[PDB]
Design a protein around this ligand. Structure first.
Ligand code: 0VW
Ligand code: ZN
Length: 257
């Protein structure tokens, strides 16, 4: 099964998932000079005041903070999107070192990590149907740089000891994802894919320009997680990022001048 190692990592995924070489794969490098301001875009509406977090899970690839998506409670609207997208989970990608870890890059710069808030289009009724559609998902991507601590991340960091290994989960109610957002909602957007198998080409990506700052100690605790299950030899969960993929026939649009 797929992973991030030399024998099962990104260069191998195309054998089981041929769409890995498709026309709208993610992530990509965002060339800031080539992206074009689009005055047709609207501000992003991020409405997370009623979000209901439930659980945090180590799935062997990353950890997911899961939300109750049985009602419009935490939704993304506006920007490039038509209609309403419900938050289902967020997770991160990160490196073994502070100079790598993001999936998207900005003028080839790698950030220490990247947060993905995953939302599905409510017109398709749930997530499994949404992933079969070209406009099924919207992923809000936020870069993490190492600097000052992000207070709203600390509850996540402090629960990681309890989900060290693959398949472990813990209650994670009453978490407010508003505390993971930067001040500005300026963004880039393009049509892409999931960055993990099955790599489905269902995503409108919305990548914020402003990174959030996290402390070195916060990201160090991400790097103490394990890819392996309990009782198995320890494999640190680091470098769980897919590199940039060919842009092919796409244009990245900017919401800002
Ligand atoms: N990293 S990612 O693009 O968000 N890929 C995902 N794969 C499975 C479903 C949700 N997300
Ligand atoms: Zn992701």
């Amino acid at each position: 099964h797929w992973g991030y190692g030399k024998h099962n990592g990104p260069e191998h995924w195309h054998k089981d998932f041929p769409i890995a070489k498709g026309e709208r794969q993610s992530p990509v490098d965002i060339d800031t000079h080539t992206a074009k301001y689009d005055p047709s875009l609207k501000p992003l509406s991020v409405s997370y005041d009623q979000a209901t977090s439930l659980r945090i899970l180590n799935n062997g690839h990353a950890f997911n903070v899961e939300f109750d998506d049985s009602q419009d409670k935490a939704v993304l609207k506006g920007g490039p999107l038509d209609g309403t997208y419900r938050l289902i989970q967020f997770h991160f990608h990160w490196g073994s070192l502070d100079g790598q870890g993001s999936e998207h890059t900005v003028d080839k710069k790698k950030y220490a990590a990247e947060l993905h808030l995953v939302h599905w289009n409510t017109k398709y009724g749930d997530f499994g149907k949404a992933v079969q559609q070209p406009d099924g998902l919207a992923v809000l991507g936020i870069f993490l740089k190492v600097g000052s601590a992000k207070p709203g991340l600390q509850k996540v960091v402090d629960v990681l000891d309890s989900i060290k290994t693959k398949g472990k989960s813990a209650d994670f109610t009453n978490f407010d994802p508003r505390g993971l957002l930067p001040e500005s909602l300026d963004y880039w957007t393009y049509p892409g894919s999931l960055t993990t198998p099955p790599l489905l080409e269902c995503v409108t990506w919305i990548v914020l320009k402003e990174p959030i700052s996290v402390s070195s100690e916060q990201v160090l605790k991400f790097r103490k997680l394990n890819f392996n299950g309990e009782g198995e030899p320890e494999e640190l969960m680091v470098d769980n990022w897919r590199p940039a993929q060919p842009l092919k026939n796409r244009q990245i649009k900017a919401s800002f001048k």
